[PDB]
Amino acid sequence: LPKAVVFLEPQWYSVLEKDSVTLKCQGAYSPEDNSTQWFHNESLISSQASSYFIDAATVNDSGEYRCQTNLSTLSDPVQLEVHIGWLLLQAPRWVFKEEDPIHLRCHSWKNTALHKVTYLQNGKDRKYFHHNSDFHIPKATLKDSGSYFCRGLVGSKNVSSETVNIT
Amino acid sequence: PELLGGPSVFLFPPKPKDTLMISRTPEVTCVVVDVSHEDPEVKFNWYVDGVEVHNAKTKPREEQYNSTYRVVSVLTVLHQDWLNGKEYKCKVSNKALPAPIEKTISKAKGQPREPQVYTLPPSREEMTKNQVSLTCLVKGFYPSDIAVEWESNGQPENNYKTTPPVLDSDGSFFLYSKLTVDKSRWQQGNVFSCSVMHEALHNHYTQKSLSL
Amino acid sequence: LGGPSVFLFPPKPKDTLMISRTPEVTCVVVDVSHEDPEVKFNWYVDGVEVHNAKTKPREEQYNSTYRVVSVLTVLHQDWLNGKEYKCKVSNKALPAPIEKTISKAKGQPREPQVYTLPPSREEMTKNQVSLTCLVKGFYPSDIAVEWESNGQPENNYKTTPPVLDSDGSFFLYSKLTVDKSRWQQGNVFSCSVMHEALHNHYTQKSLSLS
Numbered sequence: 001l002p003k004a005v006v007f008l009e010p011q012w013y014s015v016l017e018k019d020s021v022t023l024k025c026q027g028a029y030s031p032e033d034n035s036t037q038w039f040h041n042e043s044l045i046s047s048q049a050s051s052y053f054i055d056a057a058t059v060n061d062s063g064e065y066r067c068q069t070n071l072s073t074l075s076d077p078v079q080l081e082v083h084i085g086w087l088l089l090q091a092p093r094w095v096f097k098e099e100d101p102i103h104l105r106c107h108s109w110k111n112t113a114l115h116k117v118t119y120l121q122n123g124k125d126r127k128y129f130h131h132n133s134d135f136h137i138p139k140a141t142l143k144d145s146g147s148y149f150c151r152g153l154v155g156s157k158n159v160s161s162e163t164v165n166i167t
Numbered sequence: 168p169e170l171l172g173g174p175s176v177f178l179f180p181p182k183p184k185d186t187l188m189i190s191r192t193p194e195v196t197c198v199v200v201d202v203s204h205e206d207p208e209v210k211f212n213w214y215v216d217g218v219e220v221h222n223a224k225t226k227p228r229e230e231q232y233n234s235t236y237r238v239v240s241v242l243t244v245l246h247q248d249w250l251n252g253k254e255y256k257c258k259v260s261n262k263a264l265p266a267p268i269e270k271t272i273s274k275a276k277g278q279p280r281e282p283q284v285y286t287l288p289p290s291r292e293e294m295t296k297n298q299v300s301l302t303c304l305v306k307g308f309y310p311s312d313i314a315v316e317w318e319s320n321g322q323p324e325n326n327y328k329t330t331p332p333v334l335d336s337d338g339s340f341f342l343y344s345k346l347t348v349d350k351s352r353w354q355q356g357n358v359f360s361c362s363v364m365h366e367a368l369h370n371h372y373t374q375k376s377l378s379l
Numbered sequence: 380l381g382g383p384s385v386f387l388f389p390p391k392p393k394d395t396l397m398i399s400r401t402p403e404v405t406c407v408v409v410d411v412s413h414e415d416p417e418v419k420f421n422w423y424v425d426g427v428e429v430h431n432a433k434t435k436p437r438e439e440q441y442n443s444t445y446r447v448v449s450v451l452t453v454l455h456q457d458w459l460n461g462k463e464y465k466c467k468v469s470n471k472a473l474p475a476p477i478e479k480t481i482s483k484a485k486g487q488p489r490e491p492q493v494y495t496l497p498p499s500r501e502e503m504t505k506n507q508v509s510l511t512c513l514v515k516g517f518y519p520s521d522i523a524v525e526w527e528s529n530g531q532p533e534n535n536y537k538t539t540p541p542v543l544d545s546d547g548s549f550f551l552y553s554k555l556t557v558d559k560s561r562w563q564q565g566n567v568f569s570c571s572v573m574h575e576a577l578h579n580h581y582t583q584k585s586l587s588l589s
């Protein structure tokens with residue numbers, strides 16, 4: 001039988017503590033059976049829906065997720081990282097092979113208004129934006145192997161984000 | 168205004184005079200401002216060298232111009248504990264924040280240096296005046312925390328000001344304290360004196376007098 | 380609180396006290412994007428707008444931001460009497476350009492009193508000695524105070540910031556340090572003082588022995 005799959009809505013498998021997360025399960029359902037089995041690291045989460053919803057995530061939602069049916073073989077896990085803090089650097093993956101576009105969003109707690117934002121790459125602000133937006137890049141540079149992270153002004157205070165490693 | 172950033176905390180050390188005389192109460196105070204009206208409840212957390220202390224006190228108040236609450240907490244400190252380093256940590260917890268804020272404070276580090284005190288009589292050309300200036304000079308001390316007061320007979324000398332400390336060349340501190348007095352009294356030969364209380368004297372306190 | 384920021388700084392005291400020096404007001408603008416690296420200044424004085432201005436760009440250091448500064452040389456006595464130097468910075472990123480005004484501290488100009496104080500015996504027991512110059516009674520705090528043992532200026536001296544007191548004016552102290560020997564020999568030292576309420580915006584008192 002077919003191996004089911006868990007997808008994240010949105011593509012962010014790394015969020016902050018308020019972020020709503022949805023895990024859509026993809027697979028086949030039998031005749032008189034439209035149910036789904038959800039797994040959070042061994043533990044079984046009751047809900048039948050083919051969709052699991054995290055309204056306001058806490059760091060306890062972090063972990064590997066698997067979903068299944070009766071016509072789909074158990075899905076491989078999906079790591080969901082729940083972080084704490086004002087900012088958080090996001091991306092679909094920081095594994096960039098020689099040529100390939102980069103997409104960094106500087107997510108802030110409760111989508112709070114972030115201003116005078118700046119993405120940094122090795123203590124060097126790659127770019128500045130008056131208001132919060134996203135950071136783009138095309139092919140690699142065989143040197144993108146820099147530790148990134150962002151900062152800005154949540155209201156009057158300056159907030160920083162944990163620094164990630166785009167390799 | 169726009170407080171989308173939530174509360175903000177400001178920790179403060181005790182005062183030299185307190186920490187230096189056992190008869191006084193050295194206190195450390197954690198200040199939280201921008202405390203909302205929707206998320207007003209505030210929770211403090213104190214730690215002396217990591218270990219959590221439970222003997223702190225608080226009280227709320229609000230401010231006009233910005234319509235916000237100003238919550239403050241006051242923890243009493245043991246004279247020793249401060250002058251031995253023992254870092255003080257204040258963790259403020261409130262809804263508006265992703266996580267609590269932690270401020271920490273402790274006495275300035277470095278080789279404590281004994282202050283040298285020098286009294287300086289009014290300058291000759293200052294007689295033309297009805298009142299003349301009496302000067303106290305305290306130099307070569309570290310830390311910068313220090314207390315400098317003036318006395319007449321055996322009592323306070325209201326009229327005196329003191330420059331803040333000033334970082335000297337040899338990496339130490341100095342400052343001046345000017346006591347304004349009535350030409351008459353000086354000439355009359357009264358007796359004045361500046362008392363200096365610093366973390367590095369042989370009883371946390373010395374005094375140098377000055378007259379004609 | 381969006382868009383770039385603006386910082387208007389006043390002229391230098393010394394520069395405003397002696398005509399041989401050039402006093403100017405600077406309007407600095409930080410946080411200028413590469414998208415719209417362009418800024419228009421508007422200089423107004425006591426209401427009446429001015430046009431002397433001068434400028435040049437410098438985006439650098441650790442930012443993808445641009446820096447902008449507008450120097451506006453100023454007439455000595457102008458500032459000295461007090462003049463609104465309103466600066467209006469304009470950049471699209473700014474809804475409505477930002478304007479900030481600076482000027483001489485207002486109040487009633489009072490003249491300093493300068494007295495030099497010899498090092499009290501107690502200290503002479505040491506290698507180096509302290510010479511005190513007391514400048515009390517000025518308004519504003521804007522002042523200059525330096526030492527000279529001879530035409531040559533001295534290096535080993537510090538000066539407290541101006542401190543405001545009872546009287547309502549400002550005073551400060553300047554401590555010059557000198558190896559006792561010198562002092563002992565019977566040398567000469569003086570602290571000059573530049574203030575707006577001094578005869579020629581200047582005066583100096585000297586220290587010696589005996």
Ligand SMILES: *[C@@H]1O[C@H](CO[C@H]2O[C@@H](C)[C@@H](O)[C@@H](O)[C@@H]2O)[C@@H](O[C@H]2O[C@H](CO)[C@@H](O[C@@H]3O[C@H](CO[C@H]4O[C@H](CO)[C@@H](O)[C@H](O)[C@@H]4O[C@@H]4O[C@H](CO)[C@@H](O)[C@H](O)[C@H]4NC(C)=O)[C@@H](O)[C@H](O[C@H]4O[C@H](CO)[C@@H](O)[C@H](O)[C@@H]4O[C@@H]4O[C@H](CO)[C@@H](O)[C@H](O)[C@H]4NC(C)=O)[C@@H]3O)[C@H](O)[C@H]2NC(C)=O)[C@H](O)[C@H]1NC(C)=O
Pocket residue numbers: 168170177179180196198200201230232233234235237
């Ligand atoms: C909401 O309302 C609040 C307050 O209301 C308003 O009240 C009226 C009167 C109005 O006119 C304003 O005065 C006021 O806004 C408002 O502001 C609040 O936040 C500000 C900062 O934004 C706080 O100010 C801080 O003050 C400390 C010093 O505190 C004392 O001294 C000041 C000024 O001299 C007094 O006004 C205070 O009363 C404080 O009292 C002290 O209380 C203790 C009691 O025992 C005692 O120990 C002291 O003796 C006593 N002092 C007195 C009066 O004798 C400053 O030090 C702060 O500066 C620091 O922050 C900046 C950046 O934030 C740092 O760069 C700077 O360095 C200072 O901090 C540290 O420096 C070191 C090394 O340099 C670093 O290692 C540290 O990390 C660094 N800290 C930081 C943060 O980086 C600062 O100015 C103030 O407490 C609040 N107001 C109040 C209640 O006084 C707010 O903006 C307003 N907004 C809204 C919501 O609308």
Ligand SMILES: *[C@H]1O[C@H](CO[C@H]2O[C@@H](C)[C@@H](O)[C@@H](O)[C@@H]2O)[C@@H](O[C@@H]2O[C@H](CO)[C@@H](O[C@@H]3O[C@H](CO[C@H]4O[C@H](CO)[C@@H](O)[C@H](O)[C@@H]4O[C@H]4O[C@H](CO)[C@@H](O[C@@H]5O[C@H](CO)[C@H](O)[C@H](O)[C@H]5O)[C@H](O)[C@H]4NC(C)=O)[C@@H](O)[C@H](O[C@@H]4O[C@H](CO)[C@@H](O)[C@H](O)[C@@H]4O)[C@@H]3O)[C@H](O)[C@H]2NC(C)=O)[C@H](O)[C@H]1NC(C)=O
Pocket residue numbers: 116117118384386388389390391402403404405406407409410439440441442444446
């Ligand atoms: C990314 O990085 C940017 C790049 O800027 C650079 O900043 C400095 C700090 C570097 O360390 C690097 O980090 C970086 O390359 C950021 O720009 C900076 O942003 C901050 C905050 O967003 C701005 O903050 C204000 O800074 C001013 C600075 O005041 C003066 O004094 C300080 C003292 O340390 C100096 O550092 C500074 O240069 C300022 O003046 C200096 O130049 C003047 C030129 O006019 C001198 O005066 C003139 O001198 C002439 C001869 O030299 C001549 O005499 C003339 O007559 C005279 O006018 C002046 O003397 C000289 N300073 C001295 C004395 O040495 C602060 O005052 C101000 O402080 C507070 O501000 C708030 C709000 O206004 C207020 O409430 C408080 O009460 C204080 O007043 C601010 O902190 C900073 O100015 C920007 N850089 C600059 C130009 O310094 C950028 O923000 C970053 N991007 C982001 C947002 O992510």
